[PDB]
RNA sequence: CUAAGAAAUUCACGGCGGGCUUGAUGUCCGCGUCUACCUGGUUCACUGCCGUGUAGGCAG
């Protein structure tokens, strides 16, 4: 048995964009008509503060290079000057049916894959992965730089069946730590909801709302567009920020990046934090790929040796591989 | 291409990050072939457990927004991209580009099956929208509840039911749920009409629609042309460029049970219309019709005009 | 060991845009309902007063240039005709964790950098840096030209724990000199609070309000925007001022430039007062770079010697390097 | 069974300095707006109303 030349998994835990809107704390219980946070523009006269290449280090070139400064237009999102709380609201849905590929050549490989996944699920549920997902919703990973130095963060999650709230949660994103996945009764209840959703056993639709008290008029950090082509350096805008309709927002792929941060099993150190579940599991901020294929902890290696060759890995690497199948991916030769 | 016995209004659907490329020669609203494939996917996964037959689709597109930018002095536009994860050595990834957009579409589904009498209309409508809320429509996620998802209930309506006054009355009561909408239809015969008009120099059909989504500034003896409608170029199906192969012959296919042929897509024309200007609503629906011995695979709105 | 190819620090001392409002002194205590300062427009014609390049210095060409129209439109912000005090209110967060980068390739480099910064924070506080930062809040450096020629400036700083004031300071920005980092009691209390913010030992948020007594109808100075030049006949706008929802305003980075003007240790002088903390610390108005790289007091030279090769520089240059890390910046090659 | 299935753009920044927009002026002449009308439940099976309590003298 060889691998399928076409392997493709559709993602579960599909989030939306998170709109940002602002108001005052202690009125966050009625935070339904809060005004949004608008992206504006401002000017930047900068200066030269780069590392020079030890050949352009003469004093005359430095003086003549700060004669003509660096003039830019950036985008900024701010709180209004009489509101100190940032409401960030999005909806997460938990699909379920997480072992079934969305494109597979070999019908024998798909049968062996589904036997492997159902053997996993009966030998141990989705409880570990859903409690780690429940943590990354219960603290505020999806508030990326909006979380740093805030003094009070509150997360409100609502499960939704129809036009009605099935069950409400109110977490505290600073007591629930960023590193140690400690257990809790409400985390176990919400984790059982997520693990019911991931196994194809119910309709799970969450509504994730987080409030962050930062200060009147302070700066918030919506996500930033990736633009390659800009103007001719005079009228160009060096920093664009994301916005769905007249409201500064965060992309859905980086909220999904925040939910995926589970991987405490990469062979360097769990003391350096969980990383995002990826194949070749790699961190863009670190610029470095943990979990190399020259070791044997890569997703391709573990999946091929656990489906084809029946070399079942450790239980933690099973959690890693099922986290990749929940993530999605377009694999193959 | 059967006439519909009913219509099903999936009332209001926010779409998260759809595919705004549609062809090698367009960039706007996604291809209607995606909508035909979506309604066929609903026909597969729940359309047989209710003993029904979902064929037509009516595109509405209330609100549109694409993730584009014009780069500061340039007159054209570029797309906003995403960071992909790093390479195997953690260097960087090769960038391919994908346009992404946000749709707010409404779907009108034609129903043909014998199960329209065995089931109540609200159960059909509830199960269809409850299944479609876990699917995707142009490569883009179909969004759940938002600030103003108050028209959450789906509605089902049999077009044959009642008198002529009753049919047209219930039609114009449906059109009150397509309020800022703009339906998309196919206008192939107008493409051939303008080609037969200006076929003096070059009767190539690429030049024709390549000179229709435009402003045509004629000069002094300036009289720019008048727009008959919102004519936009669409992709309109596929035409083959290879002899068809057996299910085992093509290397790296999506499966080994279906025949695969390498094709080229086939550009067309159609124009956006308000839901008042259309006569009925059964003429508005998109259908897929293929001639498989030849390579003509296409979709259109048959029986519109 | 070498430097990481990517280093990036996020800024601490993160201020907001200052908004301007006007009213009467000794109604100064009730400055909560003061109306804003609106950016307005007026028309301007000037005469020829630049230098001439000796080929336009013929008399007939000069007189033809003087008979030409030279109109354009400018933005102005003035106080009202019955208001003589300018109010300038912003907020400020001090975050701390001021040596941890946010994007670092080389894991050995960031370990030795954290050892070095932790050595600094061990044997010295953030005491001198918070003393200097609290001076530049205690006087009114952030009133740039608005302070120039004012007869009475005072500053009111409120520390904010919840929607409530913990402690209030009230200074006298003209008695607190623009040069001498002197000693005071309430200023040392503010320096202890800012040093506890920079060290990570508490939540610091400030409400910095400054009142400059200027005169009835006199001109105030918001920070100026950036417009592109075209050849419009009879006057395109030649000057745009920055504003928020119809209120004249100062950019946040200009206030932040005023707050990090703590550097008296550059090799040129210290009777010339403090300059702002920049890598190879340059003044844009004076057009030259103090602290050149060839006279080895540059931030990059000091940081390379002190992290890679353990050459601890002089104590004051260590204050400079840590002030650059509190500044933030895009470091690495 | 949808040009199908996958996705972190990031950090940091001083836009400043100056200025005379002026001079002059005829808005004029003329005109048909008429024709007709019920605000009438108890503007409460009720406000003040033997018992607020399907029982009652109750500006009925």
């Amino acid at each position: 048995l060889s691998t399928a030349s076409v392997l493709a998994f559709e993602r579960k835990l599909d989030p939306s964009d998170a709109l940002m809107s602002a108001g005052a704390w202690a009125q966050r219980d009625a935070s339904q008509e809060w005004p949004a946070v608008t992206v504006r523009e401002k000017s930047v006269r900068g200066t030269i503060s780069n590392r020079l290449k030890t050949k352009d280090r003469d004093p005359a070139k430095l003086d003549a290079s700060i004669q003509s400064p660096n003039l830019q237009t950036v985008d900024v999102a701010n709180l209004p000057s009489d509101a100190d709380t940032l409401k960030v609201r999005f909806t997460l849905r938990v699909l379920g049916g997480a072992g079934t590929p969305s494109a597979c050549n070999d019908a024998a490989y798909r049968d062996k894959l589904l036997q492997t996944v159902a053997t996993y699920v009966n030998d141990q549920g989705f409880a570990e992965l859903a409690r780690r997902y429940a943590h990354n919703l219960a603290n505020a990973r999806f508030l990326w730089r909006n979380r740093v130095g805030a003094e009070a963060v509150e997360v409100r999650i609502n499960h939704i069946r129809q036009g009605e709230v099935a069950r409400a949660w109110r977490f505290d994103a600073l007591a629930i730590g960023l590193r140690d996945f400690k257990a809790d009764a409400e985390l176990d209840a919400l984790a059982e909801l997520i693990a019911s959703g991931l196994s194809g056993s119910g309709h799970v639709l969450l509504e994730v709302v987080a409030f962050a008290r930062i200060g009147d008029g302070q700066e918030v950090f919506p996500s930033q567009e990736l633009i390659l082509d800009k103007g001719d350096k005079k009228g160009q805008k060096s920093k664009t920020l994301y916005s769905v309709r007249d409201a500064a927002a965060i992309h859905s792929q980086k909220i999904g990046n925040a939910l995926r941060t589970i991987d405490t099993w990469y062979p360097d150190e769990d003391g350096l934090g969980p990383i995002a579940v990826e194949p070749y599991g790699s961190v863009t901020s670190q610029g470095k790929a943990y979990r190399q294929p020259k070791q044997k902890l890569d997703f391709y290696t573990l999946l091929d040796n656990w489906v084809l060759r029946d070399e079942a890995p450790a239980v933690e690497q099973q959690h890693y591989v099922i986290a990749n199948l929940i993530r999605g991916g377009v694999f193959g030769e | 291409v059967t006439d519909p016995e009913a219509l099903l209004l999936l009332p209001r659907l926010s779409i998260q990050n759809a595919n705004a490329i549609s062809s090698p020669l367009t960039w706007g609203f996604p291809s209607p072939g995606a909508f035909t494939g979506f309604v066929h996917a609903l026909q597969r996964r729940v359309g047989i457990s209710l003993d029904i037959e979902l064929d037509g689709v009516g595109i509405v597109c209330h609100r549109f927004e694409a993730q584009i930018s014009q780069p500061a002095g340039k007159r054209t536009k570029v797309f906003n991209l995403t960071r992909n994860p790093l390479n195997r050595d953690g260097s960087t990834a090769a960038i391919v580009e994908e346009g992404r957009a946000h749709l707010e579409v409404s779907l009108l589904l034609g129903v043909h099956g014998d199960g329209l009498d065995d089931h109540p209309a609200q159960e059909i409508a509830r199960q269809v929208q409850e299944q479609a809320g876990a699917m995707r429509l142009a490569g883009g996620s179909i969004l759940p509840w938002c600030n103003e998802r108050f028209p959450a209930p789906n509605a089902e309506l049999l077009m044959l039911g009642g008198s002529d006054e009753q049919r047209r009355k219930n039609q114009r009561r449906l059109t009150r749920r397509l309020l800022p909408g703009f339906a998309l239809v196919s206008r192939e015969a107008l493409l051939q009409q303008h080609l037969e008009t200006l076929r003096t120099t070059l009767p190539e059909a690429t030049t024709l629609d390549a000179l229709l989504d435009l402003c045509r500034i004629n000069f002094e003896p300036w009289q720019v042309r008048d727009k008959p409608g919102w004519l936009v170029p669409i992709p309109a199906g596929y035409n083959a460029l290879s002899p068809l192969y057996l299910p085992g012959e093509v290397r790296n296919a999506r499966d080994r049970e279906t025949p695969l042929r390498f094709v080229e897509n086939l550009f067309g024309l159609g124009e956006w219309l308000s839901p008042h200007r259309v006569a009925a609503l059964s003429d508005l629906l998109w259908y897929h019709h293929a001639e498989p011995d030849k390579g003509l695979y296409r979709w259109s709105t048959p029986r519109f005009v």
Side-chain angles (χ1 to χ4, degrees), chain A residues 16-20 88-90 142 242 244 248-252 255:
Chain A
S16 69
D17 298 336
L19 281 79
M20 305 199 299
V88 169
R89 183 259 182 190
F90 67 100
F142 55 90
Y242 182 73
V244 297
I250 309 168
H251 291 104
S252 67
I255 296 164

Side-chain angles (χ1 to χ4, degrees), chain A residues 47-55 59-87:
Chain A
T47 189
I48 301 300
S49 65
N50 291 319
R51 289 182 182 264
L52 302 174
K53 293 193 268 78
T54 195
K55 181 258 291 180
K61 266 76 74 177
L62 276 173
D63 291 336
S65 68
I66 69 170
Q67 289 297 112
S68 69
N70 195 0
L71 267 58
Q72 291 169 355
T73 300
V74 300
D75 285 341
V76 286
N78 287 319
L79 258 50
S81 65
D82 53 351
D84 54 351
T85 302
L86 176 66
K87 174 182 176 180

Side-chain angles (χ1 to χ4, degrees), chain B residues 60-78:
Chain B
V60 170
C61 183
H62 301 284
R63 191 176 183 271
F64 180 77
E65 186 179 3
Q67 303 185 8
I68 54 175
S69 295
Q70 55 182 357
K74 301 292 288 182
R75 182 76 277 281
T76 60
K77 293 180 177 181
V78 295

Side-chain angles (χ1 to χ4, degrees), chain A residues 19-41:
Chain A
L19 281 79
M20 305 199 299
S21 63
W25 186 267
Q27 298 177 359
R28 66 189 186 275
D29 295 326
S31 67
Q32 191 63 37
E33 293 89 3
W34 278 2
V37 169
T38 57
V39 168
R40 298 181 294 112
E41 297 173 355

Side-chain angles (χ1 to χ4, degrees), chain B residues 117-172:
Chain B
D117 297 332
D118 294 330
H119 300 283
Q122 184 61 40
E123 182 66 28
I124 294 297
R126 185 189 65 84
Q127 290 187 357
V128 169
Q129 71 176 357
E130 195 270 331
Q131 184 67 47
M135 291 172 67
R136 58 185 59 242
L137 180 43
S141 298
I142 295 169
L143 285 181
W145 186 58
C146 292
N147 54 4
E148 288 291 325
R149 188 186 67 101
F150 289 167
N154 187 356
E156 185 178 359
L157 195 143
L158 277 78
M159 292 300 291
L160 60 92
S163 65
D164 196 5
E165 178 68 27
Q166 183 59 253
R167 290 179 181 180
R168 184 255 299 160
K169 170 67 176 66
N170 209 357
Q171 168 184 352
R172 299 191 298 176

Side-chain angles (χ1 to χ4, degrees), chain A residues 100-140:
Chain A
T100 300
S102 64
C104 186
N105 288 120
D106 196 358
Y109 186 81
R110 181 171 179 172
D111 292 332
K112 188 69 179 295
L113 177 61
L114 291 174
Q115 290 176 359
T116 298
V117 172
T119 298
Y120 172 78
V121 174
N122 288 320
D123 286 334
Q124 54 190 355
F126 282 151
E128 179 71 28
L129 292 176
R131 73 173 65 95
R132 289 175 179 263
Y133 285 140
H135 279 84
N136 287 325
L137 287 171
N139 60 12

Side-chain angles (χ1 to χ4, degrees), chain B residues 1-198 203 205 207-217 220-305:
Chain B
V1 296
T2 308
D3 292 330
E5 292 181 353
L7 288 176
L8 186 63
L9 178 63
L10 293 176
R12 194 62 61 90
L13 302 180
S14 297
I15 298 166
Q16 182 68 254
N17 298 318
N19 193 2
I21 294 295
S22 308
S23 77
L25 272 70
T26 318
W27 67 269
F29 190 82
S31 175
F35 292 90
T36 64
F38 172 74
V39 183
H40 199 277
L42 277 172
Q43 179 61 41
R44 287 176 63 87
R45 61 192 294 169
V46 286
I48 63 169
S49 176
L50 295 174
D51 200 2
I52 59 172
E53 179 181 359
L54 297 169
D55 287 333
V57 57
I59 302 167
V60 170
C61 183
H62 301 284
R63 191 176 183 271
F64 180 77
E65 186 179 3
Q67 303 185 8
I68 54 175
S69 295
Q70 55 182 357
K74 301 292 288 182
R75 182 76 277 281
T76 60
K77 293 180 177 181
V78 295
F79 290 101
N80 295 322
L81 302 179
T82 62
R83 280 201 296 185
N84 304 325
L86 294 176
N87 205 356
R88 182 178 296 115
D89 56 349
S91 67
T92 190
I95 295 171
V96 300
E97 293 188 356
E98 289 179 350
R100 292 172 71 169
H102 302 283
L103 307 172
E104 189 177 3
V105 77
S106 295
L107 298 174
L108 283 169
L109 305 184
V111 191
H112 301 279
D114 52 350
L116 294 172
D117 297 332
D118 294 330
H119 300 283
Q122 184 61 40
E123 182 66 28
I124 294 297
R126 185 189 65 84
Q127 290 187 357
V128 169
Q129 71 176 357
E130 195 270 331
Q131 184 67 47
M135 291 172 67
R136 58 185 59 242
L137 180 43
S141 298
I142 295 169
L143 285 181
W145 186 58
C146 292
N147 54 4
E148 288 291 325
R149 188 186 67 101
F150 289 167
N154 187 356
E156 185 178 359
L157 195 143
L158 277 78
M159 292 300 291
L160 60 92
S163 65
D164 196 5
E165 178 68 27
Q166 183 59 253
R167 290 179 181 180
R168 184 255 299 160
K169 170 67 176 66
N170 209 357
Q171 168 184 352
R172 299 191 298 176
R173 190 182 62 82
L174 282 177
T175 312
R176 267 71 174 175
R177 297 182 73 183
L178 307 177
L179 292 170
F182 289 101
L184 179 65
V185 297
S186 178
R187 299 297 288 266
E188 186 269 328
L190 274 71
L191 191 155
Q192 189 66 39
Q193 177 177 359
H194 277 172
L195 195 274
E196 291 170 354
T197 295
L198 59 90
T207 63
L208 190 272
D209 60 348
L211 293 173
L212 277 178
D213 58 349
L214 282 173
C215 298
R216 299 296 90 197
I217 302 169
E220 303 176 358
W222 292 270
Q223 300 294 323
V224 191
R225 75 174 179 92
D226 289 330
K227 280 80 176 176
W230 193 268
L231 289 171
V232 289
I234 66 170
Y238 298 98
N239 191 1
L241 58 89
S242 178
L244 186 141
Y245 296 100
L246 292 178
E249 288 177 351
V250 183
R251 187 176 178 181
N252 302 323
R254 285 180 69 181
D255 53 352
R256 291 186 179 92
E257 296 93 7
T258 58
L260 172 52
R261 63 165 72 251
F262 297 96
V263 300
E264 176 180 359
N265 49 3
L266 191 65
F267 302 100
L269 190 71
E271 55 95 22
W272 296 89
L273 291 175
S274 177
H276 280 170
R277 194 181 295 274
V278 69
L281 296 177
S282 66
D283 51 354
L284 198 68
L285 303 183
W286 289 83
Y287 293 94
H288 53 82
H289 58 280
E291 295 181 354
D293 57 353
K294 199 173 69 179
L296 191 273
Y297 302 93
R298 65 175 291 160
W299 53 85
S300 68
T301 50
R303 293 182 295 271
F304 174 72
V305 171

